[PDB]
Recover the amino acids of this structure.
């Protein structure tokens, strides 16, 4: 059995920064460090940081006074930010620079009383944070997931309309949504393409190349990782069996019995150690040395704030 590795895969620049923010805070101030929501959507990363004295909480009311609080990589609403700022808290913000960029555009639209449409998935924390940058009642902020959602959306002034996207969407599906928005609202304004980050784009491109060669694709990442789910979905839609797995224990032997080529990738929040262990398990089940596929170069790093060095 041939084992192929997608490239690129695993940690992005936002995740690496957010994790270091928590680690460095723990190293500088000791435990406990409070973190709002899972810092990134990976069980292993979260369980680790929890074992080292990070405390994860869904609401700021759970956090005690005088504490250090960190915002997760997914970003937070103005409301949440103001609720933290108005209390006895030292705040560090692990929100990804590429989410912040989108937030800044929503905030601008809010200041102009000009309506904005977000493409994304209801209930996801990035969506809550991004929608939560819009406060002006004279405009409006709308969420669409599909072309059908676009087909039933009505806005107050479609002459003054802009759109934004979640960072971790399917590139292909998002393209269909934007085509719809432009047919329904010809004057809508947006970025050149969308707000899908380089890491999401690159991992989807990489898993396409992988699924072209592999019969079965394993995607390392947690169930609540949106970007990981898109990788597995992309593979499946290409007609390959694909499985989202947290770690090597989830691999069921039937999945790779009599499979000549298995591919492995990882979402943006999945540490490389999990991939290494997955590969060790596949090798127990017959696989050879893992062959990395040739990949688009990634070179971006985001530094921690100077105060957390
Ligand atoms: O569930 P998703 O959003 O894919 O989150 P993830 O698995 O934490 O991945 C890194 C990340 C962090 C922040 C953002 Cl807004 N997008 C991606
Ligand atoms: S938005 Fe940032 S957290 Fe990673 S998946 Fe994209 S670089």
């Amino acid at each position: 059995m041939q084992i192929l590795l997608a490239n690129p895969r695993g940690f992005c620049a936002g995740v690496d920064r957010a994790i270091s923010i928590v680690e460095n805070a723990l190293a500088i101030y000791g435990a406990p460090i409070y973190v709002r929501h899972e810092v990134v959507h990976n069980r292993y990363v979260v369980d680790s940081l929890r074992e080292r004295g990070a405390i994860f909480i869904e609401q700021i009311s759970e956090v005690p006074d005088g504490a250090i609080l960190i915002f997760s990589a997914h970003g937070v609403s103005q409301a949440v930010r103001n609720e933290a700022k108005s209390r006895d808290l030292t705040v560090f913000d692990a929100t990804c620079p590429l989410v912040t960029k989108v937030h800044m555009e929503v905030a601008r639209a809010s200041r102009r009383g000009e309506e904005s449409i977000l493409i994304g998935h209801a209930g996801h924390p990035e969506v809550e944070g991004t929608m939560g940058q819009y406060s002006n009642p004279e405009g409006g902020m709308y969420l669409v997931e599909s072309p059908d959602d676009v087909w039933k959306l009505t806005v107050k002034n479609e002459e003054k309309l802009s759109f934004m996207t979640q960072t971790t969407l399917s590139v292909d599906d998002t393209s269909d949504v934007i085509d719809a928005l432009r047919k329904r609202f010809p004057k809508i304004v947006g970025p050149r393409k969308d707000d899908i980050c380089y890491a999401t784009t690159n991992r989807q491109e990489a898993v396409r190349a992988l699924a072209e060669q592999a019969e079965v694709v394993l995607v390392v990442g947690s169930k609540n990782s949106s970007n990981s789910n898109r990788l597995a979905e992309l593979a499946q839609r290409m007609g390959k069996r694909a499985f989202l797995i947290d770690d090597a224990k989830d691999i069921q032997e039937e999945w790779v019995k009599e499979v000549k080529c298995v591919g492995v990738t990882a979402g943006a929040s999945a540490p490389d150690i999990l991939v290494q262990n997955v590969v060790a398990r596949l090798q127990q089940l017959g696989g050879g040395e893992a062959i990395p596929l040739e990949g688009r170069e990634e070179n971006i790093v985001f530094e921690v704030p100077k105060e957390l060095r």
Summary: The longest helix spans residues 13-29.
